[PDB]
Amino acid sequence: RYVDNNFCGPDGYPLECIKDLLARAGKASCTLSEQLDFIDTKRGVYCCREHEHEIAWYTERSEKSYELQTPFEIKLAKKFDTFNGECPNFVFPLNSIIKTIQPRVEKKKLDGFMGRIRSVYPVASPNECNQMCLSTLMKCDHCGETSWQTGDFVKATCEFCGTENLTKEGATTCGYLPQNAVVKIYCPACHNSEVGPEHSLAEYHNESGLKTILRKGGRTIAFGGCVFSYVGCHNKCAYWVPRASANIGCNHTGVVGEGSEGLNDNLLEILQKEKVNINIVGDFKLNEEIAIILASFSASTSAFVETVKGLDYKAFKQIVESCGNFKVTKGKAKKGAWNIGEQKSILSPLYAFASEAARVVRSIFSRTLETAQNSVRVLQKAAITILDGISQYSLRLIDAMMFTSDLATNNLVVMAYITGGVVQLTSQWLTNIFGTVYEKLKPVLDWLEEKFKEGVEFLRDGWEIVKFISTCACEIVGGQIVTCAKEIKESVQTFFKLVNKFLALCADSIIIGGAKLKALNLGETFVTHSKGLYRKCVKSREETGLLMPLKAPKEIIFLEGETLPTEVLTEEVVLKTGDLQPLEQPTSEAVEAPLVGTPVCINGLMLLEIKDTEKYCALAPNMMVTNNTFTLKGG
């Protein structure tokens, strides 16, 4: 029977043996300090004959007489200075400051629910209240793992499998106390057809059937470092509020229960500061820890979907710091800082954010798949089913994270959802490059379909492929696709090698203006080393509008494709002969920058004769300069 320095028990209430000693001594009407002086005079710890009430905790309590002490009169709790041993279970965490909600006095007459909730919080409606994040560290009977399951003080959902379990003895915690913190509990009384809404308080407790703590002062619940009381019901749900809650920094309530001592030490090192130091270690990435912290600042899931669109370090810094409770840094890991970069489990008292978006984020990145050598498409269908169950915005949220920013995760449900789309993305990617999907290119999509048969084994490779392609800067140069000068992972190198092999097999020989070029032949289109897709456009002399000599070929060859914003000095076109030689400097990569010249028709091909040099560039049907650079052997 451990007590605090005020001889009160671990539940925050007085003991019967001490009330009896004070009663027989005539000290019941005395103040707390006067009563303590008496109790200590009578040997304190040994004031009882059959008990040794070792002092385990130090608390700061109001002067109210010992008999009137409750958890609601505590302001500070810590381990007693001279207590050498492990902390027993205590209603509040150690080294915490306890806050209470002082009910407001209303001036106007209100209905039962709105009157009571508006005394607790200054809200216009229950829609302005925030459901608290309550979690319990307990075994999931459906699976066998032990983790922090999220729910309320009656039941919780296991994030790995999505099933519900009843709360059991273990470490409990409430997350960061939100504004207008409430807990919504299913109210059988309102669903019981024999009771219905507008039930009495006694009926509520009898129908609820949960194990409250019964005291002369009412029925309360102690969970996760908070003491909850019942306020009222609305929409057939019961509302509990944290009449009293601990604060260990950043408005976190800490951990109580078995094992809470070590957990609280880990929280205090990080949160027990005037300002919480959030330190991004290495490159900024939208991992689970960043997503959950940012989600904590969203009003709704859909607001978060928009918020993450194009998320970068700066936007994250500004949004998080705007509340004034955090300071965001980046660089090397620091001792005592909230170091983000190494991946850690998101199911802990830390990251226990109560926002709507945060709950969606936590669910999305915590679910597992029942993987049994299933194909990617089967896994995707399962992943989508899971994601839809979490939230109707869950797919759009992931889409935004993966395609507008830089998303990272090892969650198989998210990976399966995205990976199954690599075929559709690849089809669009090939369409963007070549204009469509050709039979010569389909083998690229057949390869992905074959890899889908590997199931989980291909999720990481597909992830990297989707990530790269989603934000790639690819261009086709002759028979090879090249990328920007970035490091390419082995899984992405493999994807591009097989794509380029299928393309090298199509590297045919074409003639443009008499010149031999190595170019892809995918059907009606071709690609040259000029870094673009072109078609052969043939028009009659009279159809071009050129001031062509009558000795020119009847048919004039143009290259239809991407062009440069160049200008033509004159409509006059020179009729000239020569041996056109392609250059390795396409797309105006030559030293010459006039971007103007005189048209010339060489072997039926229209080129612009670049001013003040001897280089030529092919013209498109619209008389704009293309990326195909030529010269003439001998001038």
Question: Least separation, in Å, of the C-beta of 91 and Zn ion?
Answer: 19
Please give the C-alpha separations between residue 428 and each of 40, 201, 213, 614, in angstroms, as whole numbers. 81, 61, 61, 40
Q: 87: annotated binding-site residue?
A: no
DSSP 481-532: EE--SS---HHHHHHHHHHHHHHHTTEEEEEETTEEEEEEESSS-EEETTTE
Question: Least separation, in Å, of the C-beta of 140 and Zn ion?
Answer: 3
Question: Least separation, in Å, of the C-beta of 240 and Zn ion?
Answer: 12
Q: Which amino acid is at 109?
A: K
State the Rg of the chain over Cα. 36
Judged by beta carbon, residue 235 or residue 266, the one nearer Zn ion is 235
Cα–Cα distance for residue pair 504/523, rounded to 1 Å: 14
Question: Least separation, in Å, of the C-beta of 17 and Zn ion?
Answer: 3
Judged by beta carbon, residue 192 or residue 266, the one nearer Zn ion is 192
Judged by beta carbon, residue 51 or residue 576, the one nearer Zn ion is 51
- Residues in CB range of 148: below 8 A, 6 or more apart: 135, 136, 137, 159, 173, 347, 348, 349, 352
Judged by beta carbon, residue 98 or residue 158, the one nearer Zn ion is 158
Judged by beta carbon, residue 161 or residue 294, the one nearer Zn ion is 161
Cα–Cα distance for residue pair 398/387, rounded to 1 Å: 10
Question: Least separation, in Å, of the C-beta of 385 and Zn ion?
Answer: 17
Judged by beta carbon, residue 190 or residue 286, the one nearer Zn ion is 190
Q: 187: annotated binding-site residue?
A: yes
Q: 250: annotated binding-site residue?
A: no
Question: Least separation, in Å, of the C-beta of 154 and Zn ion?
Answer: 14
3-state per-residue secondary structure call for 348-399: CCCCCCCCHHHHHHHHHCCCCCCCCCCCHHHHHHHHHHHHHHHCCCHHHHHH
Judged by beta carbon, residue 134 or residue 233, the one nearer Zn ion is 233
Question: Least separation, in Å, of the C-beta of 257 and Zn ion?
Answer: 20
Binding site for Zn ion (CB under 5 A): 17, 48, 51, 140, 143, 158, 160-161, 187, 189-190, 233
Q: Which amino acid is at 293?
A: I
- Give 275's DSSP letter: S
Question: Least separation, in Å, of the C-beta of 443 and Zn ion?
Answer: 42
Judged by beta carbon, residue 189 or residue 227, the one nearer Zn ion is 189
Question: Least separation, in Å, of the C-beta of 201 and Zn ion?
Answer: 10
Judged by beta carbon, residue 200 or residue 424, the one nearer Zn ion is 200
Question: Least separation, in Å, of the C-beta of 337 and Zn ion?
Answer: 32
> How many Cα atoms occupy the beta-carbon half-sphere of 569 within 13 Å?
15
Residues 52-76 as b/e (b if ≥16 CB within 10 A, e otherwise) read ebebbbbbebeeebbbebbbbbbee
Judged by beta carbon, residue 118 or residue 309, the one nearer Zn ion is 118
- DSSP alpha helices (H): ranges in 182-287? 188-191, 201-208, 260-271
Q: 529: annotated binding-site residue?
A: no
What SS3 state is found at 243? strand
Contact 200, 187 (CB under 8 A): no
Question: Least separation, in Å, of the C-beta of 156 and Zn ion?
Answer: 11
Q: 226: annotated binding-site residue?
A: no
- Residues in CB range of 213: below 8 A, 6 or more apart: 11, 219, 220, 221, 222
Contact 156, 136 (CB under 8 A): yes
Q: 323: annotated binding-site residue?
A: no
- Please report where in the chains the tokens 């009843």 appear, as a residue: 166
Contact 283, 316 (CB under 8 A): no
Judged by beta carbon, residue 219 or residue 327, the one nearer Zn ion is 219
Cα–Cα distance for residue pair 140/544, rounded to 1 Å: 77
Q: How many helices (H) and strands (E) does the chain have?
A: 17, 33
Q: 537: annotated binding-site residue?
A: no
Q: Which amino acid is at 555?
A: E
Residues 171, 288, 245: CA angle, nearest 5 degrees: 35
Q: 174: annotated binding-site residue?
A: no
Question: Least separation, in Å, of the C-beta of 189 and Zn ion?
Answer: 5
Among 87, 138, 9, 139, which Cα is nearest to 260's?
Answer: 87
Judged by beta carbon, residue 152 or residue 464, the one nearer Zn ion is 152
Q: Which amino acid is at 285?
A: K
Q: 53: annotated binding-site residue?
A: yes
What SS3 state is found at 450? helix
Cα–Cα distance for residue pair 548/539, rounded to 1 Å: 13
Q: Tell me how far apart the terminal alpha carbons of the chain are, to the nearest angstrom.
A: 104
Binding residues: 17, 48, 51, 53, 140, 143, 158, 161, 187, 190, 199, 233
Binding residues for Zn(2+): 17, 48, 51, 53, 140, 143, 158, 161, 187, 190, 199, 233
